């Protein structure tokens, strides 16, 4: 599913992501924009052989099982395919664990490089929330 901007903001809010770990809703929407272009089915292979999955490009190296990332962990206790659903619940639940891991949203390098320090409220501007 390719979400609209405001549509994804609403879905993230209902799942409790807004201000989660102190990160306002626009941070999460900005991260999703640059990670996946709001597409739940996004996948991207990393040069180490892990893969990033879903709207927030969660990495199989640590967070989900895809069966082909040797040595990796599955800290969200889910198949990586669950992160590709139209329903964002699994991605949100796992993102909550990632952002709680010590480095905040810097775990998403695209957030650090493209969202951190910017006017992230622009990503929810105009949305009926
Ligand atoms: N509990 C964990 N294993 N977290 C991930 C550890 C490494 C982390 N992805 C890093 O490069 O900054
Ligand atoms: N650390 C991340 N945010 N990884 C997800 C993708 C971001 C990175 N610029 C890439 O596409 O390779
Ligand atoms: N229609 C929107 N509000 N899009 C997101 C805002 C974009 C933001 N101003 C930026 O600098 O990229
Ligand atoms: Cl917020
Ligand atoms: Cl915001
Ligand atoms: Cl881009
Ligand atoms: Cl594996
Ligand atoms: Cl949803
Ligand atoms: Cl889900
Ligand atoms: Cl933080
Ligand atoms: Cl920040
Ligand atoms: Na894994």
UniProtKB/Swiss-Prot annotation:
Please name the catalytic residues of this protein: 35, 52
The alphabetized UniProt keywords are: Allergen, Antimicrobial, Bacteriolytic enzyme, Disulfide bond, Glycosidase, Hydrolase, Secreted, Signal
Its Enzyme Commission number? Answer: 3.2.1.17
**Positions of the C-type lysozyme domain:** 1-129
Q: Which transformation does this protein catalyse, written as a reaction?
A: Hydrolysis of (1->4)-beta-linkages between N-acetylmuramic acid and N-acetyl-D-glucosamine residues in a peptidoglycan and between N-acetyl-D-glucosamine residues in chitodextrins
Give the enzyme class: hydrolase
Annotated substrate binding lies at 101
Q: Where is this protein primarily located?
A: secreted
- Which GO terms of the molecular function aspect are on file? beta-N-acetylglucosaminidase activity; identical protein binding; lysozyme activity
UniProt keyword Disulfide bond present: yes
Expressed in which tissues: In the egg white and polymorphonuclear leukocytes.
- What are the cysteine partners in each disulfide bond? 6-127, 30-115, 64-80, 76-94
Q: One Pfam family for this entry, by name?
A: Lys
The protein's location, in the record's own words, is:
Secreted
Q: Which GO terms describe its cellular component?
A: cytoplasm; endoplasmic reticulum; extracellular space
List, in alphabetical order, the GO biological process terms annotated in this UniProt record: cell wall macromolecule catabolic process; defense response to bacterium; defense response to Gram-negative bacterium; defense response to Gram-positive bacterium; killing of cells of another organism
Would the keyword Transcription regulation turn up in this protein's UniProt record? no
Its family remark reads:
Belongs to the glycosyl hydrolase 22 family.
Q: What else is known?
A: Lysozyme C is capable of both hydrolysis and transglycosylation; it also shows a slight esterase activity. It acts rapidly on both peptide-substituted and unsubstituted peptidoglycan, and slowly on chitin oligosaccharides.
Quaternary structure and partners: Monomer.
Function noted in UniProt: Lysozymes have primarily a bacteriolytic function; those in tissues and body fluids are associated with the monocyte-macrophage system and enhance the activity of immunoagents. Has bacteriolytic activity against M.luteus.
| Protein name per Swiss-Prot or TrEMBL | Lysozyme C
Q: Which organism is it from?
A: Gallus gallus (Chicken)
